[PDB]
């Protein structure tokens, strides 16, 4: 009875973490490591580093206040080996333990590494039951399904959680209340001001250290306003539930120039490191509808993103890795344009997405999908390069969620496992859902010439290039019919325009 060494990683900052269950506070030790391996696996946004390390230090203090013995290895510690495995070994050398207990993590490569570590004591790995669907449950649901579709997974998660269920039937008599025909904000409507969290003293200290120590990483650290502990994160959630959730269903796919948050919740960076709980979030939204403070379409749309999409992508990741990370179904080989890093492009929609990534480490979903994701797919950027960008620039990015949304939904590099069709779109889509195109120097009605919106020739070149395959996919009938009715000279024209754009943008 020497006790257990309990590992807590930077995205595991929850009192209810399975590795902390049944802790013997008089014998056990919690290990937390500020890891340069993890901090450089991708060159994470400076604000992601601030968030994780500020949240970790505060979580350690919360554990100590509850009686835990915490071995906390900081970035400045000259004996820190830099890695989780190295620090495990060193912790085990410092005092006697009977075993290591940890919670399976959110990156296949680290999980595979930790599972094969040869340590002097046994290492027990527990599932991360903060998620609503276990890895085993997803595998069992997916078995024998020719295609994995969120629509059907979501119904299963509604029945299992009981969220928005009146007995055995969905509230309102339908599962999903998504509406077609949603469009951009009306000219006069101004998105409301959003609550941000001024840095607390711990966060300020970490801000100063990241500013000095990681200046080469992407992004601005000034203005950091993300919540870094459960009190701050609940404040963000409270604001969303009371002030934004009633409007959540009107504007989920709209874009407004330099209004980067609209009515979104801004909870993903906190949720993905454990500062909020998925079930609790959804129950709070359900209560808003039950009690007459929000309409059902809004609340259902919100809950579907958390118990549906979030759990579905996690399921696909662990079911399909490691091969998933290698898939390149459209044989994309291009380089990522420099403007993905600098924002220096005349494409107003792209420039605004990069602006928000740089300044806030955030862009909302339809920008990630239909602006920068769609563009990378149409350009034929190699999926490794695309995954790298999405991992670096957003404060909510962890591989389990980034990769199926990026390699899958946004770029079809997975051949449709997540998304069932490429989300390709011309500039017409961005024009219908945003206020970007009028102020953009490009003409969204033109396909050819130096004034043409690049998305237009790129879209048709993409449909053309992959025409044989997309006609088999099944769900692209309208674009292929339009392509077919085009005379040959018109097709050759947009092929040449797209070739030019790929040279101009530094792709290929
Ligand atoms: C190419 C691309 C890459 C993405 N990379 C990430 C990533 O690294 N991390 C991440 O957490 N999300 C990722 N997303 C999903 C989604 O864009 C973000 O979760 C969302 O923008 C976060 O903003 P929010 O907290 O304001 O969410 P809201 O719009 O308020 O939505 C509520 C919550 O639903 C969840 N959610 C919504 N859509 C998804 C989805 N598609 N997948 C998973 N959870 C979702 C999040 O928990 C989010 O907080 C990606 C989407 C795309 C298309
Ligand atoms: C920047 C960063 N730093 C750390 C760290 O210092 N220590 C740690 O234990 N985890 C860190 N993380 C999170 C991991 O890199 C990784 O994304 C998660 O552990 C996946 O579950 C991140 C993202
Ligand atoms: S015209 Fe094209 S490039 Fe410019 S904002 Fe519209 S969609 Fe984006």
């Amino acid at each position: 009875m020497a006790g257990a060494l309990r590992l807590v990683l930077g995205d595991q900052l929850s009192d209810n973490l399975s590795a902390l269950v049944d802790a013997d506070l008089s014998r056990d030790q919690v290990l937390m490591v500020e890891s340069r391996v993890e901090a450089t696996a991708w060159k994470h946004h400076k604000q992601k580093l601030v968030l994780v390390w500020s949240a970790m230090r505060q979580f350690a203090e919360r554990l100590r206040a509850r009686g835990f013995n915490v071995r906390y290895v900081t970035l400045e510690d000259p004996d820190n080996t830099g890695s989780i495995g190295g620090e495990l070994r060193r912790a085990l050398e410092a005092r006697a333990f009977d075993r290591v207990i940890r919670t399976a993590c959110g990156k296949w490569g680290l999980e595979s590494h930790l599972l094969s570590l040869d340590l002097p004591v046994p290492m027990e790995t527990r599932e991360d039951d903060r998620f609503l669907c276990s890895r085993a449950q997803f595998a069992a649901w997916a078995e024998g399904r020719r295609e994995l579709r969120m629509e059907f997974f979501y119904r299963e998660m509604r029945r299992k959680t009981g969220l928005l269920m009146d007995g055995d039937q969905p509230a309102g008599g339908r599962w999903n209340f998504d509406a077609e025909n949603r469009r951009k904000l009306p000219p006069g409507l101004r998105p409301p001001e959003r609550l941000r969290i001024p840095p607390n003293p711990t966060t300020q200290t970490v801000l100063e250290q990241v500013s000095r120590g990681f200046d080469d990483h992407f992004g601005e650290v000034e203005g950091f306003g993300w919540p870094t502990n459960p009190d701050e994160a609940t404040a963000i959630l409270d604001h969303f539930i009371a002030d934004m959730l009633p409007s959540f269903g009107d504007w989920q796919d709209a874009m407004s120039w330099r209004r980067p948050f609209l009515w979104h919740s801004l909870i993903s960076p906190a949720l993905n490191i454990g500062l909020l709980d998925p079930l609790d979030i959804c129950r709070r939204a359900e209560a808003a509808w039950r009690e007459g403070r929000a309409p059902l379409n809004a609340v259902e749309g919100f809950i579907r993103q958390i118990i549906g999409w979030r759990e579905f992508v996690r399921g696909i990741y662990w079911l399909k890795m490691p091969e998933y990370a290698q898939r390149n179904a459209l044989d994309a080989q291009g380089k990522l344009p420099g403007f993905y890093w600098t924002g220096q492009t005349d494409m107003a929609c792209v420039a605004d997405t990069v602006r928000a990534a740089h300044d806030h480490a955030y862009a909302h979903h339809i920008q990630r999908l239909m602006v920068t994701g769609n563009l990378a797919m149409l350009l034929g950027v190699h999926p490794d390069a695309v995954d790298d960008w999405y991992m670096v620039v957003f404060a909510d990015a962890y591989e389990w969620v980034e990769m199926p949304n990026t390699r899958g939904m946004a770029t079809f590099a997975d051949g449709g496992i997540v998304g069932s069709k490429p989300y390709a779109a011309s500039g017409a889509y961005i024009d219908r859902m945003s206020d970007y195109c009028k102020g953009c120097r490009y003409d969204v009605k033109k396909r050819l010439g130096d004034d043409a919106c690049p998305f237009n020739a790129l879209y048709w070149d993409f449909i053309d290039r992959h025409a044989q395959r997309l006609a088999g996919n099944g769900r692209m009938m309208m674009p292929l019919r339009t392509l077919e009715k085009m005379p040959d000279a018109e097709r050759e024209a947009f092929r040449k325009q797209a070739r030019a754009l790929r040279v101009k943008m530094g792709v290929s």
Side-chain angles (χ1 to χ4, degrees), residues 347-349 427 430 436-437 440 442 444 453-455:
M347 299 183 276
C349 53
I430 294 171
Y436 284 129
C437 299
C440 186
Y442 290 113
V444 75
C453 172
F455 281 88

Side-chain angles (χ1 to χ4, degrees), residues 240 248 252 264-269 271-272 302 305-306 309-310 313 362-365 368-369 373 390 394 396-398 401-402 405-406 409-410:
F240 170 73
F248 189 77
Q252 189 56 12
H264 297 277
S265 65
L266 315 187
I267 69 178
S268 56
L271 180 53
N272 286 354
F302 179 71
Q305 300 324 300
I306 301 168
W309 281 106
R310 190 173 180 265
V313 297
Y362 179 87
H364 53 82
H365 176 73
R368 297 196 209 194
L369 181 63
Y390 278 89
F394 295 127
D396 57 12
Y398 305 79
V401 55
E402 173 278 318
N405 276 300
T406 303
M409 186 194 304

Side-chain angles (χ1 to χ4, degrees), residues 177-194:
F177 298 94
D178 269 6
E180 326 212 304
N181 321 335
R182 298 257 173 211
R183 260 180 41 70
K184 65 178 87 189
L185 273 63
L189 184 60
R190 200 193 155 61
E193 308 180 42
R194 307 305 306 285

Side-chain angles (χ1 to χ4, degrees), residues 23 66 73 112 119 124 154 180 197 204 221 243-244 286 321 351 383 385 399 455:
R66 284 169 65 221
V73 189
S112 165
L119 291 180
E124 166 178 342
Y154 174 55
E180 326 212 304
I197 306 298
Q204 195 47 68
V221 88
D243 308 335
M244 309 287 139
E286 167 153 18
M321 287 287 291
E399 202 169 65
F455 281 88

